[PDB]
Amino acid sequence: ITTIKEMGRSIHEIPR
Amino acid sequence: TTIKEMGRSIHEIPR
Amino acid sequence: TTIKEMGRSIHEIPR
Amino acid sequence: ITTIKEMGRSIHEIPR
Amino acid sequence: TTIKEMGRSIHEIPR
Amino acid sequence: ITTIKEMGRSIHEIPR
Amino acid sequence: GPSSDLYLRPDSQIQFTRHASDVLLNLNRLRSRDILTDVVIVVSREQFRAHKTVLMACSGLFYSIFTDQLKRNLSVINLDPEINPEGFNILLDFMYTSRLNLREGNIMAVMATAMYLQMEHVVDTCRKFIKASE
Amino acid sequence: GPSSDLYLRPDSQIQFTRHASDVLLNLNRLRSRDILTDVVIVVSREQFRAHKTVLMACSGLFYSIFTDQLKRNLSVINLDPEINPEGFNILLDFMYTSRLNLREGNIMAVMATAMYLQMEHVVDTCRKFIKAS
Amino acid sequence: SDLYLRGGDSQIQFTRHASDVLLNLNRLRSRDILTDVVIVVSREQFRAHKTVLMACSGLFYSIFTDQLKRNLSVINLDPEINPEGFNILLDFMYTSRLNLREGNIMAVMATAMYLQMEHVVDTCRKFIKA
Amino acid sequence: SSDLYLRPGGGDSQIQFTRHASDVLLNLNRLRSRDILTDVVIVVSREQFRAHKTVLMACSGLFYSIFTDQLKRNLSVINLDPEINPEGFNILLDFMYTSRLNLREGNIMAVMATAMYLQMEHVVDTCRKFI
Amino acid sequence: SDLYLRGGDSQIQFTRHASDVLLNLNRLRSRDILTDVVIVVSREQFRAHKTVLMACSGLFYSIFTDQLKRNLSVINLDPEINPEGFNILLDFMYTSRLNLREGNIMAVMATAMYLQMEHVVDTCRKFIKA
Amino acid sequence: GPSSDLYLRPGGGDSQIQFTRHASDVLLNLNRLRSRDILTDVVIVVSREQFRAHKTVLMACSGLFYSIFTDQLKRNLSVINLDPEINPEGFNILLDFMYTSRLNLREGNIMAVMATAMYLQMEHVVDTCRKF
């Protein structure tokens, strides 16, 4: 299986 | 003073 | 209430 | 080697 | 403020 | 007895 | 000198660099053992057991639903009939593992599901992935 | 040729290398807003809110509590009086941030708390830390 | 005729000798005979024999093998160490008996880690799990 | 609520380390053999033995008597009576630090006589049976 | 001819020798060289040389001349004794200087009486009368 | 007016009393301790003749003894054998000097004190001897 690495934020950031 | 620990941090719940 | 521990109790100073 | 187990007190008992 | 004391300072251990 | 007064330092000074 | 002081002499902070991954693996193990799961998501009659906290952590949709104080005690949620059960299962595994598994033939399903769940960073990564194809 | 096929041509896997950190940060934000926190830990004078799921993930103690059949729907837990609230606070922040903050004056408290919570990997890291001092 | 005592190369094993020795060391300690160190744990003082401390504790083993600090007779433990925990471990060293009460269990356990008595710590870990 | 107490009923627990005393003696012998913290040398016919005073007092009425006198307590070299056999003494010293008494034909009487001199009657009684 | 030097028995007197010795003893103390006792004054610790303590204090003289008290390395003073007063007197023993401040004069004076330093007490009585 | 506030030292300054013969008093008591064999911790052996002393007094006065006892290995020695070339009487004169401030030179031993003091690395004594 061709694996690819994504290094950016994966999900929304719930705010303070 | 910050120190980086790279080993497992908590118990591993088994399957 | 007593419990018996039978393993080595302290470090072993080396030869 | 002939080994023998002695089970009585081995030394004088220092008193309190 | 300093002042000078000139008498024996301590007990004399005997011979 | 002939006594003489020496007034200089008598011994080495142990340093701090 | 006749004495000595046995003193712990460092204010330090230890940073456990794989702690977050270790946690997610344990959250996933809880899910697979059905330990402390508190919602069932149902997609075209298929049932998926989950932790609400992990759902709001990853998805704008579930974040919006469960930050509603009245809807916070729901235990069964049926997604919109348009949603593909397979797409949802792929995104749920992503939430609990960091892996997004795509077969030739399901990218559009996964993307659409991710758009519905409002997982925009995933959608963007799917957009790049598509363009690596067509 | 009059035709062409616009087909998505990849069996691939995308690995999001900071997703686990992103999740943990969001769990921390939810905790800081009392969102879905479902246990209150009472440590002498002080009360702490947490997600049972995060506590079971990190602490063998809580894992045993909450997989205990009778004890699973508990909503308030009183720790042993011996436990220091400041020590527990440091370990709770560790669970949600990966950062373990040690001050001169609390190392023993942190370690003892972690032994109580059965956080053996932390105890081991504390042992290493103590030995370097 | 020749009367010879054997040639069986024999060994006699006194199965309670070590236990006897330890009790006598405890008697010497309580009668303050030949104790040569004072351990200070938050202003509180404990007299003991260095050799027994080095035998049981890696921490003390390391102090008293330091070649330069050969004449130490006073050791000040870190201010965090609990005097009651230390006293239970000191009795343990001299008696093989570790006494735990509700209210001091964690103190004994953490003090034992500071003293580098890992086998005691492990026994405590087993203890608080059941 | 629920209250997590390590030993709820204000209990009284004791752990007994059944091999602790044996572990200590072995470490004492390790210290002895590496000359760590030994504080007396026993001299038996121009032969020298290093030991810990505390271990000697625990095992021997003779040494217990010497070192309970304050004047004699800070002695660091003790010359045993010239009649005492170095080999017999070395066997009894090893016994003190190991619980094991080694007898070969040719030293049994030596160990025995050394044991009375050191006033180790339990060892003497065990030696007497051994014949 | 016979060259024989000098003949009278001559004596050279080094007028600052004792002061020199005392300064070197103080340097040894501050470098923690050969200090062999710890004085404990309501939980505070002071390291010193027994010989200097016996030279200056009747109290310490009697402790360290006791046949039984041969291995003492830790002395606990009476709980009433003031740590600051004692430290001023210890500095005095090693330096010949007695430093008195408003707020500690009576402590120095009464501690000096406890330590049986009667000549220092008399000098403090002269001081307090001025 | 009707009240008064008593202060032992009003100008909360800083008073110091200097005991001008204290150091001499200390040394005399040290010599008394030595002659009564109280708390001596080293014996110096000079051609089978023995002298008891306090290590601190030796280190205070002699660069040799300072060097020996600043070695941790040699710090708990309790018997030190000086070189056989050193004269027992010359050594005894320097020991008394250490404990009394007074160096006694008689016809027949001045050279002995001289060599001994150089051996002990007591240069101030050596120079004062050379003038003599």
Side-chain angles (χ1 to χ4, degrees):
Chain A
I1 58 157
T2 313
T3 51
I4 290 89
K5 275 178 175 157
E6 174 58 61
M7 307 207 58
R9 166 165 277 287
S10 64
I11 58 191
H12 67 164
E13 177 180 343
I14 297 174
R16 300 186 179 92
Chain B
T1 313
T2 50
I3 286 91
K4 275 178 176 157
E5 172 57 61
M6 305 204 56
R8 166 168 279 288
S9 64
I10 59 192
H11 67 163
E12 178 183 347
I13 298 173
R15 301 185 180 92
Chain C
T1 316
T2 52
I3 328 90
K4 273 179 173 158
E5 175 57 58
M6 306 206 301
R8 164 167 278 286
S9 63
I10 59 191
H11 71 327
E12 179 185 348
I13 296 175
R15 303 185 181 95
Chain D
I1 298 193
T2 315
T3 48
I4 331 90
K5 275 179 173 157
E6 174 59 61
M7 307 207 57
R9 165 170 277 285
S10 66
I11 56 191
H12 69 162
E13 177 182 346
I14 295 176
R16 302 186 181 94
Chain E
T1 316
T2 52
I3 63 189
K4 276 178 174 314
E5 174 57 60
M6 307 209 57
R8 162 169 275 284
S9 65
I10 55 192
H11 67 328
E12 177 182 345
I13 298 174
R15 303 186 181 93
Chain F
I1 302 193
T2 315
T3 79
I4 332 91
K5 275 178 174 157
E6 173 57 60
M7 306 207 168
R9 166 170 280 286
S10 65
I11 58 188
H12 68 349
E13 180 182 349
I14 295 175
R16 301 186 179 94
Chain G
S3 70
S4 190
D5 294 15
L6 288 181
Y7 293 176
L8 308 167
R9 46 122 56 120
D11 286 2
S12 306
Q13 163 181 108
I14 313 190
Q15 304 176 355
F16 290 75
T17 69
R18 51 169 287 179
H19 170 70
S21 292
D22 288 340
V23 173
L24 192 71
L25 180 65
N26 279 358
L27 299 183
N28 197 29
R29 294 272 166 91
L30 296 176
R31 168 171 83 107
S32 77
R33 295 169 55 168
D34 204 30
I35 296 176
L36 242 80
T37 46
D38 54 355
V39 69
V40 178
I41 307 294
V42 183
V43 186
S44 290
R45 291 159 180 239
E46 213 193 310
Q47 291 173 358
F48 301 84
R49 106 248 293 206
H51 299 102
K52 286 173 195 178
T53 41
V54 178
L55 296 187
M56 17 201 333
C58 305
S59 157
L61 180 67
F62 292 126
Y63 180 84
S64 294
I65 293 166
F66 295 134
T67 61
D68 180 338
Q69 295 178 351
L70 316 184
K71 301 180 190 283
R72 188 171 292 178
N73 309 286
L74 292 176
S75 55
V76 174
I77 301 188
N78 292 289
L79 298 191
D80 186 281
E82 194 164 14
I83 306 309
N84 184 265
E86 187 196 22
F88 184 80
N89 193 45
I90 281 160
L91 284 160
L92 189 73
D93 286 0
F94 156 79
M95 294 181 178
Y96 279 88
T97 66
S98 297
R99 317 279 207 241
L100 189 73
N101 300 304
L102 312 168
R103 291 292 179 272
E104 178 167 80
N106 65 34
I107 303 108
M108 296 308 299
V110 176
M111 180 145 79
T113 309
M115 303 175 118
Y116 174 76
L117 297 179
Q118 310 175 20
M119 298 169 70
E120 305 303 334
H121 292 290
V122 173
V123 170
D124 293 330
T125 296
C126 292
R127 186 179 59 251
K128 274 196 296 186
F129 182 95
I130 292 191
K131 286 192 195 195
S133 308
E134 207 71 40
Chain H
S3 58
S4 189
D5 295 12
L6 290 182
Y7 295 183
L8 305 170
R9 276 297 169 264
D11 294 2
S12 306
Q13 169 183 110
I14 315 191
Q15 306 179 75
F16 292 75
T17 68
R18 48 171 287 182
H19 174 70
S21 294
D22 290 346
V23 172
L24 190 69
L25 177 64
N26 277 357
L27 297 184
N28 197 29
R29 296 276 172 94
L30 295 177
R31 171 173 79 101
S32 81
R33 294 165 54 167
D34 302 318
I35 295 180
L36 283 169
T37 38
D38 55 352
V39 67
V40 179
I41 308 292
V42 175
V43 185
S44 293
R45 56 235 83 160
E46 281 198 10
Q47 83 269 7
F48 298 103
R49 289 148 293 98
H51 302 100
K52 285 175 194 179
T53 46
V54 176
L55 295 190
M56 309 174 78
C58 303
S59 159
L61 181 67
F62 292 126
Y63 183 95
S64 295
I65 291 163
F66 297 131
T67 60
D68 186 339
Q69 296 191 353
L70 316 184
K71 300 181 188 174
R72 192 233 221 182
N73 192 245
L74 291 264
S75 292
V76 179
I77 301 188
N78 291 68
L79 301 192
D80 189 283
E82 193 166 16
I83 303 310
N84 180 262
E86 187 207 25
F88 184 80
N89 190 45
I90 254 65
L91 284 160
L92 186 70
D93 285 3
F94 159 76
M95 295 183 182
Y96 279 87
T97 69
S98 306
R99 297 179 167 215
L100 186 73
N101 297 302
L102 310 168
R103 289 159 192 76
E104 179 56 16
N106 63 26
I107 306 154
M108 295 310 300
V110 178
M111 179 164 335
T113 309
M115 299 166 154
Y116 176 74
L117 299 181
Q118 308 175 19
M119 297 174 71
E120 307 303 334
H121 290 98
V122 172
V123 173
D124 287 325
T125 299
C126 289
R127 181 177 50 88
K128 276 192 295 187
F129 183 88
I130 292 201
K131 280 267 220 327
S133 76
Chain I
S1 186
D2 295 15
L3 286 39
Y4 296 171
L5 296 167
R6 279 297 165 265
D9 236 72
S10 305
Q11 169 181 110
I12 316 188
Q13 305 177 357
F14 292 75
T15 72
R16 51 169 289 179
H17 171 70
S19 173
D20 287 341
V21 174
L22 192 68
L23 180 62
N24 276 354
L25 295 182
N26 199 30
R27 295 278 161 92
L28 294 175
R29 168 171 80 108
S30 76
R31 293 170 54 168
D32 208 31
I33 298 178
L34 253 31
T35 51
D36 54 358
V37 68
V38 161
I39 307 296
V40 181
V41 188
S42 283
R43 297 160 178 238
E44 280 191 49
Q45 301 184 7
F46 301 87
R47 282 101 41 103
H49 303 100
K50 283 174 192 178
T51 49
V52 175
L53 296 188
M54 306 173 72
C56 302
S57 160
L59 187 69
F60 292 128
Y61 182 82
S62 293
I63 293 163
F64 295 130
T65 51
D66 187 341
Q67 301 184 357
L68 317 185
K69 296 183 187 174
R70 187 170 178 182
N71 305 286
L72 298 177
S73 53
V74 179
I75 303 300
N76 296 297
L77 299 191
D78 186 280
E80 283 193 77
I81 304 310
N82 182 262
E84 184 194 20
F86 181 81
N87 190 39
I88 286 158
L89 286 156
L90 186 68
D91 280 3
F92 156 77
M93 301 183 185
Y94 277 93
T95 73
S96 303
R97 291 178 157 193
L98 187 72
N99 293 301
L100 311 172
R101 182 180 298 108
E102 174 60 21
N104 64 30
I105 299 157
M106 299 316 303
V108 178
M109 182 143 178
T111 303
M113 185 66 76
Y114 173 78
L115 299 184
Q116 305 174 17
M117 298 169 70
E118 312 304 336
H119 298 295
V120 175
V121 171
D122 290 325
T123 296
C124 290
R125 179 168 15 253
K126 276 197 296 185
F127 182 81
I128 76 190
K129 268 172 194 163
Chain J
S1 316
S2 186
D3 295 15
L4 289 180
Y5 295 178
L6 297 166
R7 280 300 169 268
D12 293 359
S13 308
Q14 169 184 113
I15 315 190
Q16 304 178 355
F17 289 73
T18 72
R19 54 174 289 180
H20 172 72
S22 173
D23 289 340
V24 172
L25 191 70
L26 178 61
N27 277 352
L28 295 182
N29 195 26
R30 295 278 161 93
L31 295 175
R32 169 172 81 103
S33 76
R34 298 170 55 169
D35 205 28
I36 296 179
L37 274 207
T38 49
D39 56 0
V40 72
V41 48
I42 309 296
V43 177
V44 185
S45 292
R46 289 155 183 234
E47 278 203 55
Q48 300 184 6
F49 303 75
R50 292 157 296 101
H52 300 99
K53 282 175 192 179
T54 44
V55 179
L56 295 186
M57 306 176 73
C59 303
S60 161
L62 185 69
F63 290 123
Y64 184 58
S65 293
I66 293 164
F67 299 134
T68 312
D69 189 343
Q70 290 295 311
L71 318 184
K72 302 178 189 283
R73 187 136 133 183
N74 303 282
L75 298 177
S76 56
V77 177
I78 299 190
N79 294 290
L80 298 192
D81 185 281
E83 195 159 14
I84 305 308
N85 182 265
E87 185 201 24
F89 180 80
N90 189 40
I91 287 158
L92 281 160
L93 182 65
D94 282 0
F95 155 77
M96 297 184 181
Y97 278 81
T98 75
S99 315
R100 294 182 311 277
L101 187 73
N102 299 307
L103 313 171
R104 298 163 193 79
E105 178 168 6
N107 64 30
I108 301 154
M109 297 311 302
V111 175
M112 180 137 69
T114 308
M116 297 117 200
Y117 179 77
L118 300 182
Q119 304 172 16
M120 300 169 72
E121 304 302 334
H122 295 295
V123 176
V124 167
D125 290 324
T126 300
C127 290
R128 192 177 66 90
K129 276 196 298 185
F130 190 56
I131 326 203
Chain K
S1 187
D2 295 15
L3 288 180
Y4 296 170
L5 45 168
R6 232 33 67 121
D9 292 4
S10 306
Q11 174 184 115
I12 317 188
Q13 305 178 275
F14 293 74
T15 74
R16 51 170 291 179
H17 173 71
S19 173
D20 288 341
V21 175
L22 193 69
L23 178 62
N24 279 353
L25 297 183
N26 197 30
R27 295 278 162 92
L28 295 174
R29 169 170 78 106
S30 75
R31 297 169 54 167
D32 211 30
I33 297 180
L34 250 29
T35 50
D36 53 357
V37 66
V38 177
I39 310 297
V40 180
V41 188
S42 82
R43 297 129 180 241
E44 277 201 87
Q45 298 182 5
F46 302 88
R47 292 161 296 176
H49 301 96
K50 282 175 193 178
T51 50
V52 173
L53 294 190
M54 304 174 69
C56 305
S57 160
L59 188 73
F60 292 129
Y61 181 83
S62 341
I63 296 164
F64 296 131
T65 47
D66 187 342
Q67 301 296 313
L68 320 184
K69 299 180 190 172
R70 186 178 296 178
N71 304 288
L72 294 180
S73 54
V74 177
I75 306 299
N76 293 293
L77 297 192
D78 184 277
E80 279 194 280
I81 303 309
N82 181 262
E84 185 196 23
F86 181 82
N87 191 41
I88 287 159
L89 286 161
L90 184 68
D91 282 3
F92 157 79
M93 298 182 182
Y94 279 87
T95 70
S96 310
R97 282 120 185 264
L98 186 72
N99 297 301
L100 311 174
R101 300 293 180 272
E102 176 57 16
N104 64 28
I105 298 153
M106 300 317 302
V108 176
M109 185 166 165
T111 305
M113 185 64 111
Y114 170 76
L115 298 183
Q116 303 173 16
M117 300 171 71
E118 311 305 337
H119 297 294
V120 173
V121 171
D122 294 331
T123 299
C124 289
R125 178 167 46 251
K126 276 194 295 186
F127 186 64
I128 290 184
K129 247 106 173 166
Chain L
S3 48
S4 185
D5 291 14
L6 291 185
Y7 297 109
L8 295 167
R9 277 299 169 268
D14 294 5
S15 308
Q16 167 183 111
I17 318 188
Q18 304 180 357
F19 289 72
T20 73
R21 52 172 290 178
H22 170 71
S24 174
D25 289 340
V26 171
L27 191 70
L28 176 62
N29 276 351
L30 295 182
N31 195 29
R32 297 280 164 93
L33 294 174
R34 169 174 78 104
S35 76
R36 299 170 56 168
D37 207 29
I38 296 178
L39 280 211
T40 48
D41 53 355
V42 70
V43 47
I44 308 295
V45 180
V46 188
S47 291
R48 287 165 179 293
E49 217 183 309
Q50 299 185 5
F51 303 63
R52 287 155 294 102
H54 304 98
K55 283 175 191 179
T56 43
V57 177
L58 297 186
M59 308 177 75
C61 304
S62 157
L64 186 72
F65 288 125
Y66 182 81
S67 293
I68 294 163
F69 297 134
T70 306
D71 186 343
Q72 295 294 130
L73 320 184
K74 301 181 189 283
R75 188 168 187 182
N76 303 119
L77 296 174
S78 56
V79 176
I80 299 190
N81 294 289
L82 298 190
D83 184 280
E85 195 162 15
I86 305 308
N87 181 266
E89 186 197 22
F91 178 80
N92 189 40
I93 287 159
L94 282 160
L95 186 67
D96 283 0
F97 155 77
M98 297 183 183
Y99 278 85
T100 73
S101 297
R102 296 185 309 277
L103 186 73
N104 289 275
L105 312 169
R106 180 178 296 107
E107 175 53 16
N109 64 31
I110 307 108
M111 297 309 300
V113 175
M114 181 62 117
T116 308
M118 201 122 42
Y119 178 80
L120 299 182
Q121 305 173 17
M122 299 169 72
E123 304 301 336
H124 294 290
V125 175
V126 173
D127 289 326
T128 300
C129 286
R130 190 173 54 247
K131 275 195 296 186
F132 185 87

